[PDB]
Amino acid sequence: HMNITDIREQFPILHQQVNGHDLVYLDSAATSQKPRAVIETLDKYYNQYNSNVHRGVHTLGTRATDGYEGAREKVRKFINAKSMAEIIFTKGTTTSLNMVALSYARANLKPGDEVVITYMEHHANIIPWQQAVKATGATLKYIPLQEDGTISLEDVRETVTSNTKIVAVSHVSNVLGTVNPIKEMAKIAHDNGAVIVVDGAQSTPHMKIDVQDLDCDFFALSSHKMCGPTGVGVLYGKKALLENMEPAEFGGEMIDFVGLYESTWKELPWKFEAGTPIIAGAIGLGAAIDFLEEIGLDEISRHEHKLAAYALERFRQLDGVTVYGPEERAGLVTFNLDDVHPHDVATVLDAEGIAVRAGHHCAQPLMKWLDVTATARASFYLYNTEEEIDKLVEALQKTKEYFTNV
Amino acid sequence: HMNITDIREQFPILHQQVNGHDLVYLDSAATSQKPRAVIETLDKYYNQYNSNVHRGVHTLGTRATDGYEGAREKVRKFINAKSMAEIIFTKGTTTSLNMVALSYARANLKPGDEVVITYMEHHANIIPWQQAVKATGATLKYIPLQEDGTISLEDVRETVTSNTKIVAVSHVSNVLGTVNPIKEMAKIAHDNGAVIVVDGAQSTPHMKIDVQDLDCDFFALSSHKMCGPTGVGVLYGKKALLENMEPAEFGGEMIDFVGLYESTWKELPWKFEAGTPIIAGAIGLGAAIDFLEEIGLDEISRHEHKLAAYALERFRQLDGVTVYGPEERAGLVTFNLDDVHPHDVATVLDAEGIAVRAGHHCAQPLMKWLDVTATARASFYLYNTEEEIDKLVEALQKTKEYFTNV
């Protein structure tokens, strides 16, 4: 069973004060902190075997290559892809989704075709499609939400038609905490002749991913949200789809033959990795996976279920506070205080050492759906505790009192 | 004056053996090693102030933002851009050039328009243009090289016409070591109504860059070649050009307003930075710049002039070896042994602890121009010494003897 003291001990950043109070970091949905295992992986790379990638040239070059390709296999195993050919290293979830929008959607959309998304999508999983449909003259449609911020499969079946070519949807909402029924949405997309594109930025850090079981056609994730370095992510795609897609970027490493005017591409996955890769970051992402696997994703998910249930209960103890989204959820709470702008909530909480985020959370259409212009969000991970949630709710109570007096 | 002992002391990776011999790393054109100042910058970021970017939310968030935007200013100063609006963080030189090819070239090319490049270009500065001209029905042309692998301005004037819209060329060749006359090429492009795109991946680490003096329209560089982290680079563009270019990628952070179907973009530079940025890497690149500035780029350039002159002289002492390119050059030597495949040269050198690269160096058209299928390359940086070059030439002599006997 997961010992939170022993876990927290591995994250040096947690052990400091802000404005004279112990740090209470509740913004892991914006980005996660790193354990020493990951930081020391980066250190060991740059101290010992940094070199460009390509085996059989020199000793450090081979070690760097083995580290990079080793990390690719770690990722394959971690999301249960069939093949390393299906695992592409990118700069992050946003780039991954843009690659699908550029290389897949822009080549498979014509007037009359639909791309179906949802009102709860992050911008990363909206704007690329807005642009893909404009370029092709296709139509963008939205699946409606139920009143508690979940999606009913009946509404999916209604919105998706035989003209739908792509359904794109979040696994987990970074605002509502909703866990969408991706496996069942994939069947509805496939039944209609569509592919499904899953935004896994908020799911992958926090619960097991099995792409064969989900049967998603594409899946995108970010390192920085799952204890890993910044600047790296993954695009998973089914091999038969990737084979038929053209590259999104061109250069060295992704070519086989280069003539004056024409070139041929390398096989997968390298076809989609142009230039010197994100060597250190990818290796550190592999170390993040190792670390998360050692703890156990199921264990992490159980911890967060407990935190979430505790937070929702304690928020219900506060008058004058609204929480958005459903009871069954991931480890985050987005809320507003009745008489206090969420930016001022965040400011006052930070003076008590508590880090939360305020704003639209890159989901302006969802904020409109919620009839608000902004919200505050506390988001959790494997290093957070019930005591920290106690601190949050006590601070929210004091916040209300403080703005009442003023 | 630059003390090479004190410089080498700061690079932990240099102090190890390969196959029982002291490491002799001569592959800095593939990638550079890092000093403790940069590694410790990454450490301090992840140990102390990692958070997503956006000021005025919480204390670590503001510190991360100030670090990231601080690094942007460091870069601006370093290449003498006018404005931080002209400094875009990317994943590397390759992505930077692809962004120009996508957002600039594909919007400003029609049948009859020309893109002019050179035979010595790296793939990163070939394939994006091949693709841009195919998409628009424009024409790709090549500036010819002189016999010593330099470019004459007369040939530039001949190749560039009033139908030329883009000239793209390397500052420094990663194979020939040629330093191209970029400032004079820019005047010829401008006189013809063209923009100039400069591939600065091999120049920026090794000599001062002044984009106002060069008058380049775009300039691309990589962190990993200039003592900085992997996975990060810069695209510089003149502000008036960037203003009129559309984004290459879409998502959070680069938007202002998002509706269901339409969005507006943020101002520069953020218009071109979609999603959570490369926070740690950018900060570490700023630390690489600080480190390089403290030593002095002119000092580094003088050291490499000395190494290059010494290497060329010592290579001329070897029978049965060909060196490609000119006498006046950057700090690298590409060569072949008369009777030995360069892959076998690299293998045998690595057993003596010496790291060089063999192959086409991502310049297959240049290899064809040279009438070879592959070459070996020794490339230098601020931590390398004449003693290391002695080791290289002694090993090449032994290599020749060894394959003669066999």
Ligand SMILES: Cc1ncc(COP(=O)(O)O)c(/C=N/C(C(=O)O)C(=O)O)c1O
């Ligand atoms: C569900 C989901 N989809 C996409 C993203 C963007 O991932 P990124 O490219 O790593 O910024 C994210 C990351 N969202 C962060 C961020 O925008 O800071 C957050 O929710 O604060 C997300 O949670």
Ligand SMILES: Cc1ncc(COP(=O)(O)O)c(/C=N/C(C(=O)O)C(=O)O)c1O
């Ligand atoms: C002149 C020049 N142009 C572009 C690049 C590609 O930069 P990258 O995107 O950091 O791989 C490079 C990096 N070339 C390396 C590499 O391909 O490993 C080398 O020359 O070995 C270059 O030197």
